Design an enzyme around this catalytic site. Structure first.
Site, PDB file in Angstrom:
ATOM      1  CE  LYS A 153      -1.987   7.119  -3.355  1.00  0.00           C
ATOM      2  NZ  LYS A 153      -2.140   6.014  -2.344  1.00  0.00           N
TER       3      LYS A 153
ATOM      4  CG  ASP B 158      -1.581   1.268   1.391  1.00  0.00           C
ATOM      5  OD1 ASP B 158      -1.732   2.197   0.596  1.00  0.00           O
ATOM      6  OD2 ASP B 158      -2.211   1.387   2.564  1.00  0.00           O
TER       7      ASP B 158
ATOM      8  CG  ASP C 232      -9.439   4.458   2.336  1.00  0.00           C
ATOM      9  OD1 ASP C 232      -8.911   5.107   3.212  1.00  0.00           O
ATOM     10  OD2 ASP C 232      -8.816   3.723   1.677  1.00  0.00           O
TER      11      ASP C 232
ATOM     12  CD  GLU D 276      -4.903   3.603  -2.532  1.00  0.00           C
ATOM     13  OE1 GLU D 276      -5.938   4.229  -2.102  1.00  0.00           O
ATOM     14  OE2 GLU D 276      -3.891   4.018  -2.834  1.00  0.00           O
TER      15      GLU D 276
HETATM   16  N1  LIG Z   1      -6.155   4.484  16.591  1.00  0.00           N
HETATM   17  C1  LIG Z   1      -6.256   5.594  15.703  1.00  0.00           C
HETATM   18  N2  LIG Z   1      -7.201   6.659  16.079  1.00  0.00           N
HETATM   19  C2  LIG Z   1      -7.546   7.519  15.280  1.00  0.00           C
HETATM   20  N3  LIG Z   1      -6.805   7.902  14.193  1.00  0.00           N
HETATM   21  C3  LIG Z   1      -5.820   7.008  13.785  1.00  0.00           C
HETATM   22  C4  LIG Z   1      -5.611   5.792  14.483  1.00  0.00           C
HETATM   23  N4  LIG Z   1      -4.456   5.032  13.904  1.00  0.00           N
HETATM   24  C5  LIG Z   1      -3.950   5.723  13.000  1.00  0.00           C
HETATM   25  N5  LIG Z   1      -5.051   6.868  12.622  1.00  0.00           N
HETATM   26  C6  LIG Z   1      -5.069   7.801  11.680  1.00  0.00           C
HETATM   27  O1  LIG Z   1      -5.316   7.187  10.274  1.00  0.00           O
HETATM   28  C7  LIG Z   1      -4.246   8.175   9.443  1.00  0.00           C
HETATM   29  C8  LIG Z   1      -3.369   7.247   8.495  1.00  0.00           C
HETATM   30  O2  LIG Z   1      -4.115   6.270   7.900  1.00  0.00           O
HETATM   31  P1  LIG Z   1      -3.720   5.464   6.739  1.00  0.00           P
HETATM   32  O3  LIG Z   1      -4.927   4.498   6.258  1.00  0.00           O
HETATM   33  O4  LIG Z   1      -2.510   4.727   7.358  1.00  0.00           O
HETATM   34  O5  LIG Z   1      -3.546   6.408   5.619  1.00  0.00           O
HETATM   35  P2  LIG Z   1      -3.082   6.348   3.951  1.00  0.00           P
HETATM   36  O6  LIG Z   1      -2.425   4.835   3.597  1.00  0.00           O
HETATM   37  O7  LIG Z   1      -2.018   7.569   4.170  1.00  0.00           O
HETATM   38  N6  LIG Z   1      -4.178   6.406   2.913  1.00  0.00           N
HETATM   39  P3  LIG Z   1      -4.529   5.635   1.693  1.00  0.00           P
HETATM   40  O8  LIG Z   1      -3.503   4.512   1.188  1.00  0.00           O
HETATM   41  O9  LIG Z   1      -4.808   7.064   0.335  1.00  0.00           O
HETATM   42  O10 LIG Z   1      -5.867   4.820   1.879  1.00  0.00           O
HETATM   43  C9  LIG Z   1      -3.550   9.021  10.219  1.00  0.00           C
HETATM   44  O11 LIG Z   1      -4.271  10.216  10.303  1.00  0.00           O
HETATM   45  C10 LIG Z   1      -3.571   8.374  11.744  1.00  0.00           C
HETATM   46  O12 LIG Z   1      -3.415   9.468  12.774  1.00  0.00           O
END
Ligand SMILES: Nc1ncnc2c1ncn2[C@@H]1O[C@H](COP(=O)(O)OP(=O)(O)NP(=O)(O)O)[C@@H](O)[C@H]1O
EC number: 3.6.4.10
Lengths: 383, 92
Positions: free
Chosen positions: A68, A7, A196, A172
């Site tokens: 990205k 991912d 998501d 995704e």
């Molecule tokens: N326990 C939690 N509570 C609240 N938020 C969280 C927690 N754990 C992770 N996050 C949030 O989730 C976000 C990152 O999520 P993530 O799905 O890892 O993002 P991404 O991969 O960058 N998106 P994409 O690949 O475009 O789906 C951040 O804002 C984190 O703060």
């Protein structure tokens, strides 16, 4: 041996591997199963992941992130020009192609966005290799469903530069649905909603599944809504408190505001399974220790409008898919922000108490499904 | 259905014998397919030949290229049987 799933995320990246019958989502050397999509350049080292993210306050202009958003794009893209204002690092024009200009080892240096994403990918590749005890080459890498050919080709290019052989670029929300084996069911076509909410972006996709075949019927959301914004609503809450308590504005202060942002992200996570969290910053501003508290109720209140507002793109996705909400057969929770108990409630209430697919760490689900698909595209999964 | 019966009969008769499957894959391919020249046993004698032709077969039927296509379901079926054929060949 194995092919891995990666991912490659706006804010975090996550690598998984199908091996010995199970998918393992693989922790990095700091113990973390997701990894910041950050690249930092100092006088002495190129930093990737956590070490890069952890130093962003002392070195804001050379800590690249959000590549990205630049990938597959022309510099004269409206989106590039809009977003540039928000970044502390410099983006330059190399013949109609965005680059990021940084200081690395005393010299000015520029990198294409696929090169930055290649650094993240390399990092992820090593994470898998450290776990597996051998070299990784073959990978399936995921992209948003709305990604065009130029963005998909640039993501594949990023893999090649990371020394990776990209077996496929997949979507995704499709990955996440593969994670749940939603394609391995006999019967009439199924409508699946992928909700998501990551760290910078919000995506709702509706998908049909029949005979193991996927089509995207509709997508919606907001490319500038995610956990970072809930963090901001928290930062300003505390800038204000700090001011009242000490008669100082830390708002001019970029290092002070960045340091509070981290404090804040950290407490927000704690708030997903506890009902209060502690904030603890040594010497936040001109020598003043900042210690304080926040409840979940309060956190939710500061974000009440952004939480609730995630239901609009849902409605919108259904009306583009030409579906009423009751014609959705599976709902899938993806992205780390979907861990926030209030988000869970609001989506379930919206679907009239229908149960949600969330048994798989939502921030890991995409990498999970990619891992499953990487095994299949090899022949590591038969029958 | 007629397109799926074809492939399932093909697999059954050829007994996970890679050479047999390669030298007859052109009989199960979707109408439209142009990227595949029929291959005789003459070009499948040595393990170099099997390998070289196999790596050409899987490209044609790869499930990634076939994504969204009207024949997707058959590309998958042939892919999977070829992968199994080849691993049986590797183990021999
Ligand atoms: N326990 C939690 N509570 C609240 N938020 C969280 C927690 N754990 C992770 N996050 C949030 O989730 C976000 C990152 O999520 P993530 O799905 O890892 O993002 P991404 O991969 O960058 N998106 P994409 O690949 O475009 O789906 C951040 O804002 C984190 O703060």
């Amino acid at each position: 041996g194995p092919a891995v799933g990666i991912d490659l995320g706006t804010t975090y990246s996550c690598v998984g591997v199908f091996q010995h019958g199970k998918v393992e989502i693989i922790a990095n050397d700091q113990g973390n199963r997701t990894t910041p999509s950050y690249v930092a350049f100092t006088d002495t080292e190129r930093l990737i992941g956590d070490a890069a993210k952890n130093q962003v306050a002392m070195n804001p202009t050379n800590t690249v992130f959000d590549a990205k958003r630049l990938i597959g794009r022309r510099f004269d893209d409206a989106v590039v020009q809009s977003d540039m204002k928000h970044w502390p690092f410099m983006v330059v024009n190399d013949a109609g192609r965005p680059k990021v200009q940084v200081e690395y080892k005393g010299e000015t240096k520029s990198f294409y966005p696929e090169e930055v994403s290649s650094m993240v990918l390399t990092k992820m590749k090593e994470i898998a290799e450290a776990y597996l005890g051998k070299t990784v080459t073959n990978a399936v890498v995921t992209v948003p469903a709305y990604f065009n050919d130029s963005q998909r080709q640039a993501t594949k290019d990023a893999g090649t530069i990371a020394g990776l052989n990209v077996l496929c670029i997949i979507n995704e929300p499709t990955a996440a649905a593969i994670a749940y084996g939603l394609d391995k069911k006999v019967g009439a076509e199924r409508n699946v909603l992928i909700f998501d909410l990551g760290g910078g972006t919000f995506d709702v996709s509706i998908l049909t599944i029949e005979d193991g075949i996927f089509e995207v019927k509709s997508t919606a959301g907001d490319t500038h809504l995610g956990g970072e914004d809930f963090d901001n609503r928290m930062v300003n809450h505390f800038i204000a408190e700090f001011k009242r308590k000490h008669k100082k504005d830390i708002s001019e202060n970029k290092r002070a505001v960045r340091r509070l942002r981290t404090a804040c992200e950290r407490a927000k996570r704690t708030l997903s399974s506890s009902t209060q969290a502690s904030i603890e910053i040594d010497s936040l501003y001109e020598g003043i220790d900042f210690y304080t508290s926040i409840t979940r109720a309060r956190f939710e209140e500061l974000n009440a409008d952004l939480f609730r507002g995630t239901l609009d793109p849902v409605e919108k996705a259904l009306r583009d898919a030409k579906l009423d909400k009751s014609q959705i057969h599976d709902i899938v929770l993806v992205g780390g922000s979907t861990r926030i108990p209030k988000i869970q409630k609001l989506l379930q209430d919206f679907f009239n108490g229908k149960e949600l697919n969330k048994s798989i760490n939502p921030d890991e689900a995409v990498a999970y499904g990619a891992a499953v698909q990487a095994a299949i595209l090899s022949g590591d999964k038969s029958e | 259905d007629p397109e799926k019966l074809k492939i399932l009969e093909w697999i059954e008769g050829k007994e996970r014998n890679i050479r047999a499957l390669l030298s007859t894959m052109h009989t199960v391919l979707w109408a439209g397919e142009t990227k595949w020249k029929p291959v005789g046993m003459a070009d499948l004698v040595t393990p170099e030949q099997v390998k070289k032709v196999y790596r050409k077969a899987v490209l044609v039927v790869h499930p990634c290229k076939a994504t969204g296509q009207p024949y997707e379901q058959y590309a998958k079926m042939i892919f999977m049987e070829l992968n199994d054929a080849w691993s049986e060949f590797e183990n021999q």
